[PDB]
Design an enzyme around this catalytic site. Structure first.
Site, PDB file in Angstrom:
ATOM      1  N   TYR A 159      -7.218  27.110  17.339  1.00 26.10           N
ATOM      2  CA  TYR A 159      -6.672  27.700  16.130  1.00 26.10           C
ATOM      3  C   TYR A 159      -5.291  27.108  15.781  1.00 26.10           C
ATOM      4  CZ  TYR A 159      -4.566  30.910  12.820  1.00 26.10           C
ATOM      5  OH  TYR A 159      -3.907  31.447  11.734  1.00 26.10           O
ATOM      6  N   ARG A 178       6.292  36.533  17.645  1.00 15.84           N
ATOM      7  CA  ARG A 178       7.319  37.314  16.992  1.00 15.84           C
ATOM      8  C   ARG A 178       6.736  38.259  15.921  1.00 15.84           C
ATOM      9  NH1 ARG A 178      11.474  35.507  13.572  1.00 15.84           N
ATOM     10  NH2 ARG A 178      10.010  34.146  12.405  1.00 15.84           N
ATOM     11  N   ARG A 194      -4.216  41.939  10.728  1.00 15.68           N
ATOM     12  CA  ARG A 194      -4.368  40.609  11.312  1.00 15.68           C
ATOM     13  C   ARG A 194      -4.167  40.640  12.807  1.00 15.68           C
ATOM     14  NH1 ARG A 194      -1.423  40.567   6.916  1.00 15.68           N
ATOM     15  NH2 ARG A 194       0.615  40.074   7.823  1.00 15.68           N
ATOM     16  N   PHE A 201      14.907  16.690  10.605  1.00 19.64           N
ATOM     17  CA  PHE A 201      13.682  17.321  10.089  1.00 19.64           C
ATOM     18  C   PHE A 201      12.835  17.923  11.201  1.00 19.64           C
ATOM     19  CE2 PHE A 201      10.303  18.338   7.161  1.00 19.64           C
ATOM     20  CZ  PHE A 201       9.101  18.001   7.771  1.00 19.64           C
TER      21      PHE A 201
HETATM   22  O1  LIG Z   1       1.847  31.890   4.901  1.00 23.80           O
HETATM   23  C1  LIG Z   1       2.927  31.802   5.570  1.00 23.80           C
HETATM   24  O2  LIG Z   1       4.074  32.078   5.110  1.00 23.80           O
HETATM   25  C2  LIG Z   1       2.844  31.312   7.025  1.00 23.80           C
HETATM   26  O3  LIG Z   1       1.615  30.558   7.330  1.00 23.80           O
HETATM   27  C3  LIG Z   1       1.085  30.456   8.702  1.00 23.80           C
HETATM   28  C4  LIG Z   1      -0.389  30.897   8.837  1.00 23.80           C
HETATM   29  O4  LIG Z   1      -1.024  31.280   7.816  1.00 23.80           O
HETATM   30  O5  LIG Z   1      -0.909  30.811   9.987  1.00 23.80           O
HETATM   31  C5  LIG Z   1       1.164  28.972   9.133  1.00 23.80           C
HETATM   32  O6  LIG Z   1       0.378  28.213   8.169  1.00 23.80           O
HETATM   33  C6  LIG Z   1      -0.572  27.231   8.619  1.00 23.80           C
HETATM   34  C7  LIG Z   1      -1.032  26.265   7.522  1.00 23.80           C
HETATM   35  C8  LIG Z   1      -0.001  25.931   6.403  1.00 23.80           C
HETATM   36  C9  LIG Z   1       1.037  24.872   6.851  1.00 23.80           C
HETATM   37  C10 LIG Z   1       2.067  24.601   5.771  1.00 23.80           C
HETATM   38  C11 LIG Z   1       3.266  23.705   6.125  1.00 23.80           C
HETATM   39  C12 LIG Z   1       4.372  24.213   6.821  1.00 23.80           C
HETATM   40  C13 LIG Z   1       5.468  23.398   7.108  1.00 23.80           C
HETATM   41  C14 LIG Z   1       5.457  22.069   6.665  1.00 23.80           C
HETATM   42  C15 LIG Z   1       6.536  21.227   6.910  1.00 23.80           C
HETATM   43  C16 LIG Z   1       6.500  19.913   6.467  1.00 23.80           C
HETATM   44  C17 LIG Z   1       5.399  19.400   5.785  1.00 23.80           C
HETATM   45  C18 LIG Z   1       4.306  20.219   5.523  1.00 23.80           C
HETATM   46  C19 LIG Z   1       4.320  21.547   5.953  1.00 23.80           C
HETATM   47  C20 LIG Z   1       3.241  22.368   5.693  1.00 23.80           C
HETATM   48  C21 LIG Z   1       2.617  28.509   9.060  1.00 23.80           C
HETATM   49  O7  LIG Z   1       3.046  28.132   7.968  1.00 23.80           O
HETATM   50  N1  LIG Z   1       3.372  28.576  10.172  1.00 23.80           N
HETATM   51  C22 LIG Z   1       4.833  28.299  10.133  1.00 23.80           C
HETATM   52  C23 LIG Z   1       5.164  27.087  11.036  1.00 23.80           C
HETATM   53  C24 LIG Z   1       4.128  25.939  10.893  1.00 23.80           C
HETATM   54  C25 LIG Z   1       4.578  24.648  11.610  1.00 23.80           C
HETATM   55  C26 LIG Z   1       4.267  23.410  10.734  1.00 23.80           C
HETATM   56  C27 LIG Z   1       4.947  22.189  11.355  1.00 23.80           C
HETATM   57  C28 LIG Z   1       4.316  21.599  12.461  1.00 23.80           C
HETATM   58  C29 LIG Z   1       4.887  20.497  13.094  1.00 23.80           C
HETATM   59  C30 LIG Z   1       6.122  19.970  12.642  1.00 23.80           C
HETATM   60  C31 LIG Z   1       6.693  18.843  13.309  1.00 23.80           C
HETATM   61  C32 LIG Z   1       7.896  18.308  12.861  1.00 23.80           C
HETATM   62  C33 LIG Z   1       8.553  18.896  11.754  1.00 23.80           C
HETATM   63  C34 LIG Z   1       8.015  20.007  11.080  1.00 23.80           C
HETATM   64  C35 LIG Z   1       6.788  20.568  11.519  1.00 23.80           C
HETATM   65  C36 LIG Z   1       6.188  21.687  10.871  1.00 23.80           C
HETATM   66 MG   LIG Z   2      -3.134  31.048   7.224  1.00 25.04          MG
END
Ligand SMILES: O=C(O)CO[C@@H](C(=O)O)[C@@H](OCCCCCc1ccc2ccccc2c1)C(=O)NCCCCCc1ccc2ccccc2c1
Ligand SMILES: [Mg+2]
Ligand SMILES: [Mg+2]
Length: 330
Positions: free
Chosen positions: A133, A180, A190, A250
Protein backbone atom coordinates in the site's frame (compact mmCIF):
# COMPACT_ATOMS: atom_id res chain seq x y z
CA UNK A 1 5.07 32.07 -17.47
CA UNK A 2 1.93 31.39 -19.53
CA UNK A 3 -1.51 31.92 -18.03
CA UNK A 4 -2.11 28.17 -17.76
CA UNK A 5 1.23 27.59 -16.01
CA UNK A 6 0.51 30.41 -13.59
CA UNK A 7 -2.85 28.84 -12.70
CA UNK A 8 -0.92 25.54 -11.97
CA UNK A 9 1.39 27.25 -9.54
CA UNK A 10 -1.64 28.86 -7.91
CA UNK A 11 -3.15 25.39 -7.36
CA UNK A 12 0.19 24.15 -6.06
CA UNK A 13 0.31 26.99 -3.55
CA UNK A 14 -3.29 26.25 -2.43
CA UNK A 15 -3.10 22.45 -2.29
CA UNK A 16 0.32 22.16 -0.56
CA UNK A 17 5.68 24.85 -2.35
CA UNK A 18 8.46 27.43 -2.33
CA UNK A 19 10.57 24.28 -2.07
CA UNK A 20 9.17 23.00 -5.36
CA UNK A 21 9.55 26.56 -6.72
CA UNK A 22 13.21 26.64 -5.64
CA UNK A 23 13.97 23.62 -7.85
CA UNK A 24 16.58 24.31 -10.61
CA UNK A 25 15.81 24.49 -14.33
CA UNK A 26 13.33 22.07 -15.91
CA UNK A 27 12.80 20.21 -12.62
CA UNK A 28 10.66 22.99 -11.30
CA UNK A 29 7.75 22.69 -13.76
CA UNK A 30 8.03 18.89 -14.04
CA UNK A 31 7.64 18.50 -10.27
CA UNK A 32 4.92 21.16 -10.03
CA UNK A 33 2.82 19.22 -12.63
CA UNK A 34 3.70 15.78 -11.14
CA UNK A 35 2.38 17.04 -7.83
CA UNK A 36 -0.90 18.35 -9.23
CA UNK A 37 -1.46 15.26 -11.33
CA UNK A 38 -0.99 12.87 -8.38
CA UNK A 39 -3.02 15.11 -6.07
CA UNK A 40 -5.81 14.91 -8.68
CA UNK A 41 -5.60 11.09 -8.78
CA UNK A 42 -5.56 11.02 -4.99
CA UNK A 43 -8.55 13.36 -4.88
CA UNK A 44 -10.51 10.76 -6.88
CA UNK A 45 -9.19 7.98 -4.63
CA UNK A 46 -10.06 9.78 -1.36
CA UNK A 47 -13.58 10.60 -2.54
CA UNK A 48 -15.96 8.24 -0.74
CA UNK A 49 -18.87 9.68 -2.77
CA UNK A 50 -17.51 7.92 -5.88
CA UNK A 51 -18.71 4.31 -6.10
CA UNK A 52 -16.03 1.65 -6.48
CA UNK A 53 -17.65 0.94 -9.84
CA UNK A 54 -16.94 4.52 -11.01
CA UNK A 55 -13.64 4.89 -9.14
CA UNK A 56 -11.86 1.84 -10.57
CA UNK A 57 -11.81 2.94 -14.28
CA UNK A 58 -11.06 6.47 -13.08
CA UNK A 59 -7.96 5.14 -11.20
CA UNK A 60 -6.89 2.69 -13.95
CA UNK A 61 -7.36 5.21 -16.78
CA UNK A 62 -6.10 8.38 -15.10
CA UNK A 63 -2.73 8.02 -16.88
CA UNK A 64 -4.60 8.22 -20.24
CA UNK A 65 -6.57 11.36 -19.26
CA UNK A 66 -3.28 13.27 -19.22
CA UNK A 67 -3.29 12.90 -23.01
CA UNK A 68 -7.02 13.86 -23.40
CA UNK A 69 -7.08 17.71 -23.63
CA UNK A 70 -10.81 17.99 -22.67
CA UNK A 71 -10.95 15.52 -19.74
CA UNK A 72 -12.15 16.90 -16.41
CA UNK A 73 -14.22 15.47 -13.59
CA UNK A 74 -17.12 17.49 -12.27
CA UNK A 75 -18.58 15.20 -9.61
CA UNK A 76 -15.97 15.38 -6.83
CA UNK A 77 -16.98 16.32 -3.30
CA UNK A 78 -13.41 16.92 -1.99
CA UNK A 79 -11.76 20.22 -1.10
CA UNK A 80 -9.06 20.11 -3.84
CA UNK A 81 -11.75 19.37 -6.46
CA UNK A 82 -10.47 22.39 -8.44
CA UNK A 83 -7.56 20.38 -9.91
CA UNK A 84 -10.09 17.85 -11.28
CA UNK A 85 -12.55 20.45 -12.55
CA UNK A 86 -9.74 22.51 -14.20
CA UNK A 87 -7.79 19.37 -15.18
CA UNK A 88 -7.52 20.44 -18.82
CA UNK A 89 -5.35 23.31 -17.59
CA UNK A 90 -2.99 20.83 -15.81
CA UNK A 91 -2.93 18.28 -18.62
CA UNK A 92 -2.11 21.11 -21.12
CA UNK A 93 0.96 21.91 -19.03
CA UNK A 94 1.75 18.25 -18.60
CA UNK A 95 1.75 17.96 -22.43
CA UNK A 96 3.95 21.06 -22.66
CA UNK A 97 6.61 19.24 -20.60
CA UNK A 98 9.61 17.67 -22.30
CA UNK A 99 8.72 14.07 -23.20
CA UNK A 100 11.27 12.53 -20.84
CA UNK A 101 9.33 14.13 -17.93
CA UNK A 102 5.84 13.39 -19.34
CA UNK A 103 6.67 9.68 -19.66
CA UNK A 104 7.89 9.47 -16.07
CA UNK A 105 4.69 11.09 -14.76
CA UNK A 106 2.39 9.01 -17.01
CA UNK A 107 4.07 5.71 -15.93
CA UNK A 108 3.79 6.48 -12.21
CA UNK A 109 0.20 7.57 -12.59
CA UNK A 110 -0.52 4.30 -14.36
CA UNK A 111 1.14 2.17 -11.66
CA UNK A 112 -0.24 4.10 -8.64
CA UNK A 113 -3.71 3.90 -10.18
CA UNK A 114 -3.53 0.08 -10.41
CA UNK A 115 -2.34 -0.06 -6.80
CA UNK A 116 -4.91 2.37 -5.47
CA UNK A 117 -7.73 0.48 -7.24
CA UNK A 118 -6.39 -2.76 -5.63
CA UNK A 119 -6.87 -1.34 -2.09
CA UNK A 120 -10.39 0.15 -2.47
CA UNK A 121 -11.42 -3.40 -1.71
CA UNK A 122 -9.53 -4.05 1.53
CA UNK A 123 -7.80 -2.78 4.68
CA UNK A 124 -4.12 -3.32 5.31
CA UNK A 125 -3.54 -6.73 6.94
CA UNK A 126 0.12 -7.69 7.16
CA UNK A 127 3.19 -5.54 7.50
CA UNK A 128 3.93 -6.74 3.96
CA UNK A 129 0.59 -5.29 2.83
CA UNK A 130 1.33 -2.04 4.59
CA UNK A 131 4.60 -1.82 2.58
CA UNK A 132 2.72 -2.60 -0.64
CA UNK A 133 0.00 0.00 0.00
CA UNK A 134 2.64 2.60 0.97
CA UNK A 135 4.62 1.76 -2.25
CA UNK A 136 1.52 2.29 -4.34
CA UNK A 137 0.63 5.66 -2.80
CA UNK A 138 3.97 7.07 -1.62
CA UNK A 139 6.94 4.93 -2.65
CA UNK A 140 6.00 5.44 -6.30
CA UNK A 141 6.10 9.24 -5.74
CA UNK A 142 9.72 8.87 -4.55
CA UNK A 143 10.44 6.77 -7.59
CA UNK A 144 8.88 9.25 -10.00
CA UNK A 145 10.65 12.23 -8.42
CA UNK A 146 13.95 10.43 -8.50
CA UNK A 147 13.56 9.77 -12.23
CA UNK A 148 12.82 13.44 -12.92
CA UNK A 149 16.01 14.34 -11.06
CA UNK A 150 18.03 11.90 -13.17
CA UNK A 151 16.15 12.56 -16.47
CA UNK A 152 16.75 16.27 -16.03
CA UNK A 153 20.45 15.28 -15.49
CA UNK A 154 20.76 17.37 -12.29
CA UNK A 155 21.42 14.07 -10.47
CA UNK A 156 23.35 10.86 -11.30
CA UNK A 157 21.38 8.04 -13.09
CA UNK A 158 21.67 6.00 -9.86
CA UNK A 159 19.21 8.38 -8.16
CA UNK A 160 16.59 7.50 -10.77
CA UNK A 161 17.41 3.77 -10.85
CA UNK A 162 17.69 2.71 -7.16
CA UNK A 163 13.99 2.23 -6.70
CA UNK A 164 14.24 0.79 -3.19
CA UNK A 165 16.01 3.83 -1.69
CA UNK A 166 13.50 6.10 -3.40
CA UNK A 167 10.72 3.77 -2.29
CA UNK A 168 11.97 4.04 1.32
CA UNK A 169 11.83 7.82 1.16
CA UNK A 170 8.09 7.73 0.37
CA UNK A 171 7.37 4.95 2.88
CA UNK A 172 8.93 6.89 5.76
CA UNK A 173 6.78 9.91 5.01
CA UNK A 174 3.59 7.98 4.44
CA UNK A 175 3.97 5.72 7.52
CA UNK A 176 4.73 8.77 9.66
CA UNK A 177 1.52 10.38 8.40
CA UNK A 178 -0.60 7.19 8.90
CA UNK A 179 0.80 6.76 12.44
CA UNK A 180 0.17 10.33 13.50
CA UNK A 181 -3.30 10.43 11.81
CA UNK A 182 -4.75 7.50 13.82
CA UNK A 183 -7.70 9.44 15.31
CA UNK A 184 -8.85 11.69 12.48
CA UNK A 185 -8.68 8.62 10.22
CA UNK A 186 -10.61 6.53 12.76
CA UNK A 187 -13.21 9.25 13.07
CA UNK A 188 -13.60 9.38 9.27
CA UNK A 189 -14.17 5.66 8.79
CA UNK A 190 -10.62 5.03 7.56
CA UNK A 191 -8.36 2.19 8.74
CA UNK A 192 -4.73 2.27 7.59
CA UNK A 193 -2.89 0.76 10.57
CA UNK A 194 -1.94 -2.85 9.67
CA UNK A 195 -4.35 -5.36 11.29
CA UNK A 196 -1.51 -7.83 11.82
CA UNK A 197 -0.09 -5.28 14.29
CA UNK A 198 -3.13 -3.71 15.97
CA UNK A 199 -4.94 -7.09 16.31
CA UNK A 200 -2.22 -8.25 18.65
CA UNK A 201 -3.47 -5.52 21.05
CA UNK A 202 -7.23 -5.03 20.62
CA UNK A 203 -10.20 -6.67 18.90
CA UNK A 204 -10.81 -3.58 16.75
CA UNK A 205 -8.76 -0.63 15.55
CA UNK A 206 -11.36 1.84 16.92
CA UNK A 207 -10.73 0.45 20.43
CA UNK A 208 -7.49 2.52 20.63
CA UNK A 209 -9.72 5.59 21.02
CA UNK A 210 -11.24 4.31 24.34
CA UNK A 211 -9.50 5.49 27.49
CA UNK A 212 -9.29 1.97 28.95
CA UNK A 213 -7.02 0.85 26.10
CA UNK A 214 -4.51 3.72 26.20
CA UNK A 215 -1.57 1.50 27.34
CA UNK A 216 -2.17 -0.96 24.50
CA UNK A 217 -2.68 1.91 22.07
CA UNK A 218 0.67 3.47 23.01
CA UNK A 219 2.40 0.07 22.76
CA UNK A 220 1.03 -0.42 19.23
CA UNK A 221 1.93 3.14 18.39
CA UNK A 222 5.55 2.49 19.47
CA UNK A 223 5.74 -0.76 17.51
CA UNK A 224 4.60 1.01 14.33
CA UNK A 225 6.98 3.89 15.01
CA UNK A 226 9.77 1.36 15.36
CA UNK A 227 8.64 -0.16 12.05
CA UNK A 228 8.85 3.34 10.37
CA UNK A 229 12.42 3.86 11.73
CA UNK A 230 13.73 0.95 9.55
CA UNK A 231 13.55 3.22 6.47
CA UNK A 232 15.97 5.78 7.88
CA UNK A 233 19.20 4.06 6.75
CA UNK A 234 17.82 4.19 3.15
CA UNK A 235 16.77 7.80 3.64
CA UNK A 236 20.29 8.65 4.71
CA UNK A 237 21.78 6.64 1.77
CA UNK A 238 19.33 8.38 -0.55
CA UNK A 239 20.11 11.87 0.69
CA UNK A 240 23.92 11.19 0.68
CA UNK A 241 23.84 10.80 -3.11
CA UNK A 242 22.14 14.07 -4.00
CA UNK A 243 24.45 16.65 -5.54
CA UNK A 244 22.10 19.42 -6.58
CA UNK A 245 21.28 21.84 -3.72
CA UNK A 246 17.72 22.62 -4.67
CA UNK A 247 17.05 18.81 -4.99
CA UNK A 248 18.78 18.11 -1.70
CA UNK A 249 16.57 20.63 0.18
CA UNK A 250 13.45 19.36 -1.66
CA UNK A 251 14.17 15.88 -0.47
CA UNK A 252 15.67 16.50 2.99
CA UNK A 253 12.95 18.87 4.24
CA UNK A 254 10.02 16.46 4.32
CA UNK A 255 12.28 13.81 5.87
CA UNK A 256 13.44 15.99 8.77
CA UNK A 257 9.84 17.02 9.45
CA UNK A 258 8.76 13.40 9.57
CA UNK A 259 11.68 12.52 11.86
CA UNK A 260 10.60 15.26 14.31
CA UNK A 261 6.91 14.28 14.05
CA UNK A 262 7.77 10.63 14.82
CA UNK A 263 9.87 11.63 17.87
CA UNK A 264 6.89 13.77 18.87
CA UNK A 265 4.53 10.81 18.54
CA UNK A 266 6.87 8.34 20.27
CA UNK A 267 5.22 7.09 23.50
CA UNK A 268 2.78 9.93 23.27
CA UNK A 269 -0.73 9.32 24.59
CA UNK A 270 -1.94 12.44 22.75
CA UNK A 271 -1.88 10.60 19.38
CA UNK A 272 -5.13 8.88 20.52
CA UNK A 273 -6.76 12.17 21.59
CA UNK A 274 -5.91 14.42 18.62
CA UNK A 275 -3.43 15.62 16.03
CA UNK A 276 0.16 15.83 17.21
CA UNK A 277 2.08 18.34 15.15
CA UNK A 278 5.45 19.93 15.57
CA UNK A 279 5.39 23.64 16.39
CA UNK A 280 5.61 26.09 13.48
CA UNK A 281 8.92 27.67 14.64
CA UNK A 282 10.37 24.24 15.15
CA UNK A 283 9.36 23.34 11.59
CA UNK A 284 10.87 26.57 10.21
CA UNK A 285 14.27 25.92 11.89
CA UNK A 286 14.43 22.31 10.61
CA UNK A 287 13.63 23.45 7.07
CA UNK A 288 16.35 26.12 7.23
CA UNK A 289 18.87 23.64 8.68
CA UNK A 290 18.27 20.76 6.27
CA UNK A 291 20.70 21.82 3.53
CA UNK A 292 23.63 19.44 3.90
CA UNK A 293 24.27 15.86 5.03
CA UNK A 294 26.19 16.68 8.18
CA UNK A 295 23.24 18.84 9.37
CA UNK A 296 20.54 16.37 8.41
CA UNK A 297 22.49 13.56 10.09
CA UNK A 298 22.75 15.57 13.35
CA UNK A 299 19.01 16.27 13.26
CA UNK A 300 18.26 12.58 12.71
CA UNK A 301 20.69 11.56 15.52
CA UNK A 302 19.32 14.13 17.96
CA UNK A 303 15.70 13.07 17.54
CA UNK A 304 16.72 9.37 17.55
CA UNK A 305 18.60 9.94 20.89
CA UNK A 306 15.49 11.59 22.21
CA UNK A 307 13.31 8.60 21.28
CA UNK A 308 15.97 6.23 22.64
CA UNK A 309 16.00 7.81 26.10
CA UNK A 310 12.22 7.75 26.17
CA UNK A 311 11.82 4.03 25.49
CA UNK A 312 10.01 2.30 28.36
CA UNK A 313 11.80 -0.83 29.61
CA UNK A 314 8.47 -2.68 29.51
CA UNK A 315 7.48 -1.58 26.02
CA UNK A 316 7.14 -4.87 24.11
CA UNK A 317 9.11 -3.37 21.19
CA UNK A 318 11.86 -1.84 23.30
CA UNK A 319 14.76 -4.00 22.13
CA UNK A 320 13.74 -3.52 18.48
CA UNK A 321 13.48 0.25 18.89
CA UNK A 322 16.94 0.20 20.51
CA UNK A 323 18.49 -2.04 17.73
CA UNK A 324 17.28 0.20 14.88
CA UNK A 325 18.32 3.46 16.57
CA UNK A 326 21.71 1.81 17.26
CA UNK A 327 22.03 0.86 13.53
CA UNK A 328 21.08 4.33 12.31
CA UNK A 329 23.61 5.95 14.67
CA UNK A 330 26.50 3.80 13.51
O1 LIG B 1 -5.07 13.79 0.61
C1 LIG B 1 -4.15 14.19 1.39
O2 LIG B 1 -4.06 15.37 1.84
C2 LIG B 1 -3.06 13.19 1.80
O3 LIG B 1 -2.93 12.04 0.89
C3 LIG B 1 -2.36 10.75 1.33
C4 LIG B 1 -3.28 9.54 1.06
O4 LIG B 1 -4.40 9.71 0.50
O5 LIG B 1 -2.84 8.40 1.40
C5 LIG B 1 -1.05 10.52 0.55
O6 LIG B 1 -1.40 10.52 -0.87
C6 LIG B 1 -0.90 9.49 -1.74
C7 LIG B 1 -1.03 9.82 -3.23
C8 LIG B 1 -0.92 11.33 -3.62
C9 LIG B 1 0.55 11.82 -3.67
C10 LIG B 1 0.63 13.30 -4.00
C11 LIG B 1 2.01 13.98 -3.91
C12 LIG B 1 2.53 14.40 -2.68
C13 LIG B 1 3.77 15.04 -2.61
C14 LIG B 1 4.46 15.30 -3.81
C15 LIG B 1 5.68 15.96 -3.79
C16 LIG B 1 6.35 16.20 -4.98
C17 LIG B 1 5.84 15.78 -6.21
C18 LIG B 1 4.61 15.12 -6.25
C19 LIG B 1 3.92 14.87 -5.07
C20 LIG B 1 2.70 14.22 -5.11
C21 LIG B 1 -0.09 11.67 0.82
O7 LIG B 1 -0.22 12.70 0.15
N1 LIG B 1 0.81 11.54 1.81
C22 LIG B 1 1.66 12.68 2.24
C23 LIG B 1 3.15 12.35 2.02
C24 LIG B 1 3.41 11.62 0.67
C25 LIG B 1 4.91 11.49 0.34
C26 LIG B 1 5.16 11.80 -1.15
C27 LIG B 1 6.67 11.91 -1.38
C28 LIG B 1 7.39 10.71 -1.47
C29 LIG B 1 8.77 10.72 -1.66
C30 LIG B 1 9.47 11.96 -1.73
C31 LIG B 1 10.89 11.95 -1.92
C32 LIG B 1 11.58 13.16 -2.01
C33 LIG B 1 10.87 14.38 -1.90
C34 LIG B 1 9.48 14.41 -1.72
C35 LIG B 1 8.75 13.19 -1.63
C36 LIG B 1 7.34 13.16 -1.45
MG1 LIG C 1 -5.53 8.46 -0.93
MG1 LIG D 1 -5.20 11.67 0.32
Amino acid sequence: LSSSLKTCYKYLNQTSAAVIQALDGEMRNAVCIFYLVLRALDTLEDDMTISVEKKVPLLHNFHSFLYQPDWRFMESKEKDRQVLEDFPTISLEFRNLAEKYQTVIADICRRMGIGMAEFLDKHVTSEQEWDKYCHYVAGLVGIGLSRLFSASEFEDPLVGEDTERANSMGLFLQKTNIIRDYLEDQQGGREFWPQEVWSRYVKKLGDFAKPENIDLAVQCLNELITNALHHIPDVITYLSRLRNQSVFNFCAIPQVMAIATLAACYNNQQVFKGAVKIRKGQAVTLMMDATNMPAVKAIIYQYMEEIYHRIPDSDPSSSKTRQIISTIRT
